[PDB]
From Swiss-Prot, chain A:
Note: Present with 2810 molecules/cell in log phase SD medium.
Record's subunit section: Component of the mitochondrial small ribosomal subunit (mt-SSU). Mature yeast 74S mitochondrial ribosomes consist of a small (37S) and a large (54S) subunit. The 37S small subunit contains a 15S ribosomal RNA (15S mt-rRNA) and 34 different proteins. The 54S large subunit contains a 21S rRNA (21S mt-rRNA) and 46 different proteins.
UniProt source species: Saccharomyces cerevisiae (strain ATCC 204508 / S288c)
Protein name as it appears in the record: Small ribosomal subunit protein uS17m
UniProt xrefs under SUPFAM superfamilies: Nucleic acid-binding proteins
GO molecular function, a single term: rRNA binding
Swiss-Prot record, chain B:
Source organism per UniProt: Saccharomyces cerevisiae (strain ATCC 204508 / S288c) (Baker's yeast)
Assembly and oligomerization: Component of the mitochondrial small ribosomal subunit (mt-SSU). Mature yeast 74S mitochondrial ribosomes consist of a small (37S) and a large (54S) subunit. The 37S small subunit contains a 15S ribosomal RNA (15S mt-rRNA) and 34 different proteins. The 54S large subunit contains a 21S rRNA (21S mt-rRNA) and 46 different proteins.
Location of this fragment in the whole protein: 54 to 106 of 318
Function: Component of the mitochondrial ribosome (mitoribosome), a dedicated translation machinery responsible for the synthesis of mitochondrial genome-encoded proteins, including at least some of the essential transmembrane subunits of the mitochondrial respiratory chain. The mitoribosomes are attached to the mitochondrial inner membrane and translation products are cotranslationally integrated into the membrane.
Location of this chain's protein in the cell: Mitochondrion
Annotated gene: PET123
Domain of life, per lineage: Eukaryota
Protein family per UniProt: Belongs to the mitochondrion-specific ribosomal protein mS26 family.
Signal peptide: none
Stated name of the protein: Small ribosomal subunit protein mS26
Note: Present with 2010 molecules/cell in log phase SD medium.
RNA sequence: ACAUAUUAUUAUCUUAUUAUUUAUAUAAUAUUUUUUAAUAAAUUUAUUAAUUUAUAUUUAUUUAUAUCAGAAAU
RNA sequence: GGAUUAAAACUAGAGUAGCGAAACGGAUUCGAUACCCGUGUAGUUCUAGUAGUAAACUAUGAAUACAAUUAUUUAUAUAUAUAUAUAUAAAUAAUAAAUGAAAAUGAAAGUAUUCCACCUGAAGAGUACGUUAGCAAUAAUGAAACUCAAAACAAUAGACGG
RNA sequence: GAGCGUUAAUCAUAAUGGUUUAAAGGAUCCGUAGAAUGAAUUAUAUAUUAUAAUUUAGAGUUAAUAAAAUUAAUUAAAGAAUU
RNA sequence: AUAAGAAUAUGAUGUUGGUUCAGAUUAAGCGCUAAAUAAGGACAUGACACAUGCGAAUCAUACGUUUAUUAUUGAUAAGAUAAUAAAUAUGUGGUGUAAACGUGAGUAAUUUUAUUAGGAAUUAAUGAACUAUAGAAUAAGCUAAAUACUUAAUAUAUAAAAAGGAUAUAUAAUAUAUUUAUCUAUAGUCAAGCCAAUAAUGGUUUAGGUAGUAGGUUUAUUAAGAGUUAAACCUAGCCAACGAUCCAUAAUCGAUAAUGAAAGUUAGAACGAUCACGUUGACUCUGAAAUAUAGUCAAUAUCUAUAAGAUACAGCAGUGAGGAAUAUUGGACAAUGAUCGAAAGAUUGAUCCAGUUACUUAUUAGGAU
């Protein structure tokens, strides 16, 4: 049949309807006693100009098409070259949109900081008026303004404590919950495995059919999936 | 797309029908001609042997 | 340095021959075509030599391109 | 392919104490274009460049896996009845094995794997010619003919040593 | 041995090699090609290769903690001595 | 599967390292020597120049021409006609020389070689010349005549042909029969064109090369693809340090020869395969295929007939030259082939034999006492 080769497109878009395909064949080199790969570039006809540099293609022998062209593209085995072209175009649009959004979020942050620098009022001073007015009874209009600078309509001892909350405090509680879950899951499964009877019951209670007839790994995974379905779904 | 001016498929294999090959190559004389001549008889004998072979 | 021989090349010069392509002929031949003499046969027809007519095939000269080779330069 | 690359050298402009090619003198010597002494120019210094060469040496390319010990430092860690002790790496020193022409190497110059550079008698010769690069000195690349049966390394025993 | 010798030639006769010290490590590193080489498991395939998925022992990124004050370039200073 | 080393360093030793030797061989030469026979080889050099003879002829059953005899005709013999038997290849024709033979100049590959269970454009109304089968073979002209040539007729969009001769018999030139030729068609056989992939010496101290160059589109040309060639219009490519381009050198190869344990290396004389060439260059004709050992023109040399002449020994033998060196100016067509012829036969320096030469191989070249 017509001789067919597999190769990588190494040049495209330089000649009209012609691409350069790199074909590697296996040969034996008697001198060094080693089976080597021999490489050669073929000028190949691309009637539809579909192939792109980087594509893996199969080329088939044809009639003479030019001084040096004797093969044509017969199939695109892998289209990595075509993908590269599509992803580059999308990237230009995708990145422009993201950069525009980030540029607008940077100018907004700058405006807020500038606005705050125009308000001579300082947190300490404001928190020293909400704690003196709340301990003296005075209600100068500054407080009403302060009830707008911060949005704190009510001036109580439990409102300054909520104006000065630090994110670290929330992190400390989320970390304890995370540690609890891990510790509970491990103790639960550890105990369950220690007692085969309580383990068999555990599986049946959660909806396993004849858990007794199961393997150690085929069933410990069920136990693990259940212990993690009784401490993460209920919570 | 295959190259313009080229056949997309390979030419169909030509299978020989031996009955048709024999009929066209070594066809039998259509009539039993009168080979009274000495040279006609020799030619008839040679043609028969060649066709048999 | 150089004096030699050999080969290759060319925006050059000359060029046999050939191919291709131009223009021209009161060009030749055949046929057609228009007439015209001479001759012959018969009692218009044929032949030959001319002229007119187109057609095909050649010929001579001519235009352009390429070309063995030689010259010059490298 | 690229970059960096001692000393000397060169281009331009500053600097110039000391040192110091050269040069000119003083000695030494049979002679002394030397060793020693004097006067001491370039250079040695700085700035901006050129150039890409050294015994540019561990005369030992880089990477990975692996193999028997001791000693000494360093680092990290651990413990305590708190200052040592116990660990794990690195460095260095001396070694086993192994390797090697031996001298020796010793975690490689061992056991293996991968990649690069390089060599094929001496002399001619890192020369000639050409080319490339540089302001230049030069640097890179790099032969052949002729001639010879040499030539070289480690080690051994001597002889000799101002 | 009807040849023998000689000259001219061909093949064989050590790489089942080497490069600290004998010919031979590039001054050094960076890095391109390499038709150079190079991890693990499983499944396919047309099979020491290809593809897909999965993995972290090589190679990297960031941070935390501890440690160190060297090496480049630049700028600003000090010191003994010499003439 | 078959793998050996030796001499030479050094005061001595170990090692590095070259040199030389022991083996086989030749397209061999030379020195000395030499018996017969059988077989295999023989200008590697100047693709230098060549005296002389040969190497390609054959057909009389294509046409024509020339004799003799006999018969008939011709009232005198010049001729004619037919039969018979001869002659003619200095007239017109047919077929044969694209092979074979010789040589290795050119050729490093758009061309050449080798290989592949390769390919398409998806190769002509090509048969070259045999086989099988079927059909056809007509009319004029031109020449002295024809199987010469020319123009027509009819034969698979349809296109595209031809030829008679010899011998008998019967007729009144014609017809049959036999024999040998001619043309067309179909298939077979033999045999052609083109392309791909892979391999094929040295120098980069030849590093850049290319400009129809790389690709696209269209026409012309061809049986047929393609910057293969010619014309036009576009794109800016293509090759290259895994060596481009350039230069030098060389015919290539094997189931051939030599060598080695082998991988290999060498040769390419001999045997065989392939290519190229026939003093040099280009071009054209015929043809399926030729830049043909043809033709045309030119170049170089020679010759005689002095013409827009002939010849070119790389066919055989042979000669001079060159060189260390390579042979008979032999016999025969008996054999195997080739060409012409219907046959009888003719031709054949293909070929087969012999000669010369230890160039190679083999056998023999007296045993017992
Ligand atoms: K084309
Ligand atoms: K100074
Ligand atoms: K050193
Ligand atoms: K290296
Ligand atoms: K060594
Ligand atoms: K000696
Ligand atoms: K030796
Ligand atoms: K001899
Ligand atoms: K005849
Ligand atoms: K000959
Ligand atoms: K040749
Ligand atoms: K007949
Ligand atoms: K080259
Ligand atoms: K010969
Ligand atoms: K014969
Ligand atoms: Mg001209
Ligand atoms: Mg010319
Ligand atoms: Mg200066
Ligand atoms: Mg001095
Ligand atoms: Mg520099
Ligand atoms: Mg130097
Ligand atoms: Mg050096
Ligand atoms: Mg140093
Ligand atoms: Mg590294
Ligand atoms: Mg130099
Ligand atoms: Mg020594
Ligand atoms: Mg003998
Ligand atoms: Mg060997
Ligand atoms: Mg090494
Ligand atoms: Mg080094
Ligand atoms: Mg060195
Ligand atoms: Mg890591
Ligand atoms: Mg010997
Ligand atoms: Mg003989
Ligand atoms: Mg010869
Ligand atoms: Mg006759
Ligand atoms: Mg004749
Ligand atoms: Mg021939
Ligand atoms: Mg007729
Ligand atoms: Mg006639
Ligand atoms: Mg004819
Ligand atoms: Mg005709
Ligand atoms: Mg017709
Ligand atoms: Mg040179
Ligand atoms: Mg074309
Ligand atoms: Mg071309
Ligand atoms: Mg053109
Ligand atoms: Mg030659
Ligand atoms: Mg060979
Ligand atoms: Mg031969
Ligand atoms: Mg050869
Ligand atoms: Mg011969
Ligand atoms: Mg020829
Ligand atoms: Mg010629
Ligand atoms: Mg000729
Ligand atoms: Mg000749
Ligand atoms: Mg001869
Ligand atoms: Mg002589
Ligand atoms: Mg003869």
């Amino acid at each position: 049949a017509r001789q067919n080769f597999l190769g990588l497109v190494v040049s495209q878009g330089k000649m009209q309807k012609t691409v350069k395909v790199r074909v590697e064949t296996k040969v034996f080199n008697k001198k060094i006693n080693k089976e080597l790969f021999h490489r050669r570039d073929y000028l190949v006809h691309d009637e539809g100009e579909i192939s792109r540099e980087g594509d893996l293609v199969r080329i088939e022998a044809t009639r003479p098409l030019s001084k040096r062209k004797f093969f044509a593209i017969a199939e695109i085995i892998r289209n990595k070259g075509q993908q590269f072209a599509l992803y580059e175009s999308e990237a230009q649009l995708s990145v422009a949109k993201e950069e525009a959004q980030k540029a607008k979020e940077f100018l907004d942050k700058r405006s807020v900081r500038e606005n705050k620098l125009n308000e001579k009022t300082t947190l300490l001073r404001d928190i020293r008026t909400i704690q003196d007015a709340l301990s003296s009874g005075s209600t100068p209009k500054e407080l009403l303004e302060i009830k707008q600078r911060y949005g704190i309509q009510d001036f109580s001892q439990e409102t300054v404590r909520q104006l000065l909350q630090l994110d670290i405090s929330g992190l400390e509680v989320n970390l304890e919950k995370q540690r609890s879950l891990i510790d509970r899951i491990q103790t639960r499964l550890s105990e369950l495995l220690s007692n085969d009877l309580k383990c068999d019951q555990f599986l049946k209670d959660h909806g396993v059919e004849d858990p007794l007839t199961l393997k150690k790994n085929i069933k410990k995974n069920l136990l693990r999936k259940h212990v993690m379905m009784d401490m993460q779904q209920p919570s | 797309k295959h190259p313009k001016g080229s056949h997309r498929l390979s030419p169909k294999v030509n299978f020989i029908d031996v009955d048709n090959l024999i009929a066209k190559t070594v066809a039998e004389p259509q009539s039993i001609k009168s080979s009274n001549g000495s040279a006609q008889k020799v030619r008839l004998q040679k043609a028969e042997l060649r066709r048999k072979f």
